[PDB]
Every structure is written in structure tokens, then in C-alpha cells.
Design a protein around this ligand. Structure first.
Ligand SMILES: NC(=O)c1ccc[n+]([C@@H]2O[C@H](COP(=O)([O-])OP(=O)(O)OC[C@H]3O[C@@H](n4cnc5c(N)ncnc54)[C@H](OP(=O)(O)O)[C@@H]3O)[C@@H](O)[C@H]2O)c1
Length: 240
């Protein structure tokens, strides 16, 4: 039985990754982490004993300590960690950018990831496990008003390369999922887009209106397969 931790499992891509893991292997176990306790408890209930819900904010080290304690007690091992929790706000031009909101975005998208990797590494070394990071095309392309988010995914890509280089017993891969039909894209269209140049926002509303947003299960099946089968050595540390 392989045990995967998925952060951000209460909705969107991360929820789809959990479901795809359970669909693709009958023995696999998943530890689902996010703040929304009611959603996670429903995931646990629907998954026939194969999901352990751990509710909490990943930016608190108490969450991460409890996550590892409970995973080890219930399943005894960690084989894969899917780093999917993330936030997009603040979507603001640099001339208007609220640095306190930037600090919060980095807590979620990067500093909590450093803490999660540090605390899981002893178990992941034993299992030769794979760390999977959810990145974005914004990590290399400068979307208007997204300097905070895009810079944090650039930092995340580098952190994945650094991890693979320092820890040869594990594998690490940073994967952008394309554009995915989730609340984060809905937020772009209906909330954040008023801070974006009209032409820049029109790219995302066009994708929506043309029915080109991916169902989360589609990129989610690729993370699930990587979580179950491992990262291929020729892509270790890379961004794809
Ligand atoms: N087109 C796209 O949608 C797209 C494109 C490229 C990359 N991504 C990346 O895909 C990942 C998933 O985002 P999504 O599109 O699935 O949006 P989403 O549906 O809003 O899911 C975001 C997830 O992160 C969790 N989360 C946020 N802050 C958290 C925290 N402090 N502690 C724990 N969990 C937290 C949320 O759960 P709670 O609110 O329950 O905590 C939710 O489960 C993000 O890293 C995003 O950057 C998305």
C-alpha cells in the first residue's frame, strides 16, 4: 500500500488528485489536508477507509506536526507528497501591491512547503518517495497583476530543483497543470480580473467561454499516476 499526502484536498485540483489516486489503485491510501474540515470529513466518509482527513492551515507548523503524527499512526509510511495548496491573491499591479498580502501568499505557496518537506523527509527517504509540486505557467510568464503569485511559483520551481539535488534518495517534480476549471479561475473571472488589464483578463474569460478549461480530473490523473508510480529519473528536479 502506497500512502500519498495531498494538500489542498478540499476542492479543485487537489480533490481531483485524491479521487484519481483512489480510482487508479485499489490499495492506495491518501492523507487529505486543507482547512475546510467539513469537506475533508466527507472525503473520508466516501472513501471506505482509504482517506485520512487532517484539517488545518498548512502555514501553522502544528498542522504539519499533527499531519505526520496521524499519518504514521494510521498508515505507517509516506510514499508521496503532492504540494497542491495555494493562493493567487494579491492580484494587484506592482504600483498598488499590498506587501502584507504578499507575505501571506508566500506563507502558503512556499514557506509552508519548506516546512512540510523538512518534516516529511525522514519518511520519504525510507520510501524513496516522490515530491510533486503544483506550479503554474505564471512561474515563467509575466501575467498582468500576478507578480506575487508568479514569483512564488518561480521560487517553488527552484526549491524543487534544490530539493532533488540535496536529497538523492527522493525524487521531485514541479508540474504546471494547464488551466483548470476550479474556484481559482472563477476568482480570476469574477473578483481579481477587475485589477487586471482588460486584454489580460480577456484571455481567461475566453478560455472559460470557449469551454477550454480542463476538468480537474484530467490533469489530476497525471499527478495521481506520478504519485503512484514515481517520478522518472530524467525529469527529477525539473519543471514541466
Ligand atoms: N487554472 C488553475 O486552476 C491553476 C493553474 C495553475 C496552477 N494552479 C495551482 O493549482 C493548485 C490548486 O488550486 P485550484 O485551482 O485547485 O484552486 P482551489 O480550488 O481554490 O483549491 C485551492 C486549495 O488550496 C487549499 N488551501 C489554500 N490555503 C490553504 C492553507 N493555508 N492551508 C491548507 N489548504 C489551503 C484550499 O482549501 P481550504 O480553503 O479548505 O484550506 C483548496 O483545497 C494551486 O497551487 C494553484 O496555484 C491552478
Amino acid at each position: 500500500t502506497k500512502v500519498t499526502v495531498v494538500t489542498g484536498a478540499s476542492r479543485g485540483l487537489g480533490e481531483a488528485i485524491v479521487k484519481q489516486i483512489l480510482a487508479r489503485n485499489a490499495d492506495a491510501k491518501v492523507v487529505a489536508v486543507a482547512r475546510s474540515a467539513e469537506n475533508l470529513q466527507k472525503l473520508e466518509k466516501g472513501s471506505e477507509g482509504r482517506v485520512l482527513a487532517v484539517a488545518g492551515d498548512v502555514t501553522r507548523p502544528e498542522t504539519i506536526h499533527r499531519l505526520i503524527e496521524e499519518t504514521v499512526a494510521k498508515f505507517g509510511r509516506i510514499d508521496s507528497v503532492v504540494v497542491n495548496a495555494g493562493v493567487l491573491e494579491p492580484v494587484q499591479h506592482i504600483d498598488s501591491l499590498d506587501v502584507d498580502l504578499v507575505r501571506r501568499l508566500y506563507e502558503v505557496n512556499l514557506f509552508s512547503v519548506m516546512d512540510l518537506v523538512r518534516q516529511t523527509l525522514p519518511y520519504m527517504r525510507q520510501s524513496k518517495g516522490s515530491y510533486l509540486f503544483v506550479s503554474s505557467g505564471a512561474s515563467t510568464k509575466p501575467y498582468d497583476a500576478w507578480s506575487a503569485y508568479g514569483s512564488s511559483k518561480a521560487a517553488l520551481n527552484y526549491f524543487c530543483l534544490s530539493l532533488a539535488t540535496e536529497e538523492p534518495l527522493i525524487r521531485a517534480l514541479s508540474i504546471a497543470p494547464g488551466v483548470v476549471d476550479t474556484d481559482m479561475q472563477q476568482d480570476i473571472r469574477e473578483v481579481f480580473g477587475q485589477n487586471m488589464a482588460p486584454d489580460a483578463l480577456k484571455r481567461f474569460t475566453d478560455l472559460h467561454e470557449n469551454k477550454q478549461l480542463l476538468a480537474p480530473e484530467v490533469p489530476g490523473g497525471f499527478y495521481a499516476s506520478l504519485a503512484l508510480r514515481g517520478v522518472p529519473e530524467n525529469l527529477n528536479g525539473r519543471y514541466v
